[PDB]
Amino acid sequence: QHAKILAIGTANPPNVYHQKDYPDFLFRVTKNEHRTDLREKFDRICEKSRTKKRYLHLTEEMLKANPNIYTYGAPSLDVRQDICNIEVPKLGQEAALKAIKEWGQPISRITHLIFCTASCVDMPGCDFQLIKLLGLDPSVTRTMIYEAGCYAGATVLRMAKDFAENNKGARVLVVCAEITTVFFHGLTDTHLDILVGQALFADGASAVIVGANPEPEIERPLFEIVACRQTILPNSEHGVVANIREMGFNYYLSGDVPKFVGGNVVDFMTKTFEKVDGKKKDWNSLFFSVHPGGPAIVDQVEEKLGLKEGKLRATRHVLSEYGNMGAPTVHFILDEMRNKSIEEGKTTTGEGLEWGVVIGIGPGLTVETAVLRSESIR
Amino acid sequence: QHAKILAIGTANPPNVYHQKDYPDFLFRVTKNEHRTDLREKFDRICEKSRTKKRYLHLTEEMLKANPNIYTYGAPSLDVRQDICNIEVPKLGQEAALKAIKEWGQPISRITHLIFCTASCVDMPGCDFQLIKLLGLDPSVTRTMIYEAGCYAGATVLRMAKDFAENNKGARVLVVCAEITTVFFHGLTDTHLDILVGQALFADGASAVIVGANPEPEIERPLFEIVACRQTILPNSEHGVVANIREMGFNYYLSGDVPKFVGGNVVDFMTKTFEKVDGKKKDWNSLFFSVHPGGPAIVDQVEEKLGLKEGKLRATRHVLSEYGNMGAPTVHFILDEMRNKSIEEGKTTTGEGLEWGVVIGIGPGLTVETAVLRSESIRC
């Protein structure tokens, strides 16, 4: 009786930024139009980003009111936090209400809450704020995951699995929400990593309901969370770093991250599936939700696992339409996969296949995998 | 087959600050000797603190090198983080090695790590840093609890319970570490709450190993984690607030926190024990580890539960000898209880008693309780 995903909901800020327009926007609003060298570099990155549009909370008016946000290294944490500590739970609320609607049970039936964000930090936390917004039972059992990073969309499923399976009748609401206002920085030739985040990072929230022993003909499972594994990729501590500073949340990204992922994916996939089955897996027999940290990560997984054309379609679709929203992204991909599977008349939520995986990738480098089974559409 | 606590280790920074000397120290090193008004207030708080000494990482030399740390509201997060992001995992390491020694198994048997701190935040986190320091398996399953606050010593036991019980053979290392350098602020009559934290807050780390199905040739359980409950006390959102700011981690403490705890303790105890056997009265039958957020919280629990003299001795001992170290404190109290029980020749690690409770109290106000059973002390 494994934990099942019973519902998925998602949300994004209302303002859409088409990638074709973003270089002009960024260089104009940050007063960097004279930096033709940086503009060339940014254009090259955007052209390769495989991201067509992103939703962002941040607006030009907010930048005009708080120019410290685009003045590289200036003190600005306080204004960023004042925004994100409000906007993160609000965006999470929107996703949560959608998940709860799908699930079809009363809010009072939720026994556990996991809230995850890398975009803010406060005491009481986002979990407390969401309890207030939703009217959750004040005795919900909470887990508040702050500043984990891009592997956490898999991690929260692992945590939810344990809580749901060890507590009879438990129903876990999992909310991941990101507002990248805290990570926005201006442009300097001494910190080119910012050009990558400026091209890729985006805002969004997901919500998932998890429970074991779904009520027959009442709850409708989408996926089963079978087994999970977390690991640190050797010799990659510099891959993704983010520091909480007076200037906001600063970050560094190694150009070697894709190669590290590609160099470890056979191993981490093999060791993950060893927890479920003693037989060797055919990687093409699986469905995939891969955290699209950037386009090259997706390509590395495809290449090293020998995946056929189109296997990573759902992943690429979300990267294209939403960008890298951090931890929620893999949940957007599962939702997209389920929806496309309905559209195509597939037999299961996992593209007609039985077994699949969620791959989260973030600081360490850390990879967390969750092995899933699909569920029947009918 | 419930999860058991198999070991507890603790650590503190080396420098001891006796409470009798602390007002003179604080007012001297922060250049506030002219604030005789604030000194009077601080003396009264220290007199009532029931804290005799504390261990602190922060030194006078660090303050001299970084005077923004004592300049109220000045930018100082970066220097605080540069200290705490290093010192928190290091202090945790010290506690963890002690727990691991008691536990008696190789480090390779650790499958899960929970790291908890309210003193810093970074990516990768303290959990990653501790893995490196200890040489844990790179595939340990991690939970990194940042900025929860003072309920979390109970919360991490709840989390460890579920991880240990749902993953057969799992062994969970739980490390809670606090370095209050990030919370140190200077003195202003516009923010008197700082006088309370200056009197009470302290540094320390705990490490606990949790596992179900103890290995009889090696492992020796101390307590069993039976059932847990987390709740928000009504109408108390202003009780404890802490914000992560350019000036460091700022905090506000309502004078009404003890009254909220006292007003709710019978209810939260009753609802917790509803998960076990329906206990509704006669609270003296239990042993207790109560987070000593301040002296008045301890006194309110004692009064409202009708506890007899000496029931909260272990709690009061840790408050006296260590202060309020945040989440680790309740683990120090369990360790003290176990050690006093050995000294006195009690039949169990819980002062001879069978059932007990850990009470964590922090922002929300949030209370997390963990119902424990003790274990036998061999002959």
Numbering used by the authors:
A (entry chain B): 10 to 387
B (entry chain A): 10 to 388
What sentences appear in the manuscript?
Type III PKS catalysis involves the loading of a CoA-tethered substrate onto an active-site cysteine followed by chain elongation via iterative decarboxylative Claisen condensations of malonyl-CoA. Linear poly­ketide intermediates undergo a terminal intramolecular cyclization reaction to produce the final cyclic polyketide product. The five-layered αβαβα topology of secondary-structural elements of each monomer is consistent with the ‘thiolase fold’ originally observed in thiolase and present in all known structures of type III PKSs.
Biphenyl synthase (BIS) generates the core chemical scaffolds of biphenyl and dibenzofuran phytoalexins commonly found in the Pyrinae subtribe. Differences in the side-chain torsion angles of Tyr260 in MdBIS3 (χ1 = 61°) and Tyr269 in HaBPS (χ1 = 50°) compared with Phe265 of CHS (χ1 = 170°) significantly reorient the tyrosine side chains and increase the conformational flexibility of the nearby Leu262 in MdBIS3 and Leu271 in HaBPS. Lastly, the side-chain conformation of Tyr260 in MdBIS3 is stabilized via the presence of a water-mediated hydrogen bond to the backbone carbonyl of Phe192. Replacement of Thr197 in CHS with Phe in MdBIS3 (Phe192) appears to be responsible for closing off access to the coumaroyl-binding region of CHS. Met267 of HaBPS is substituted with a Phe in MdBIS3 (Phe258) and seems to primarily function in stabilizing the conformation of nearby residues including Phe192. The sides of this novel pocket in MdBIS3 are formed from the side chains of Cys125, Ala127, Ala157, Glu187 and Ala336 as well as the main-chain atoms of Gly158, Ala157, Gly335 and Ala336.
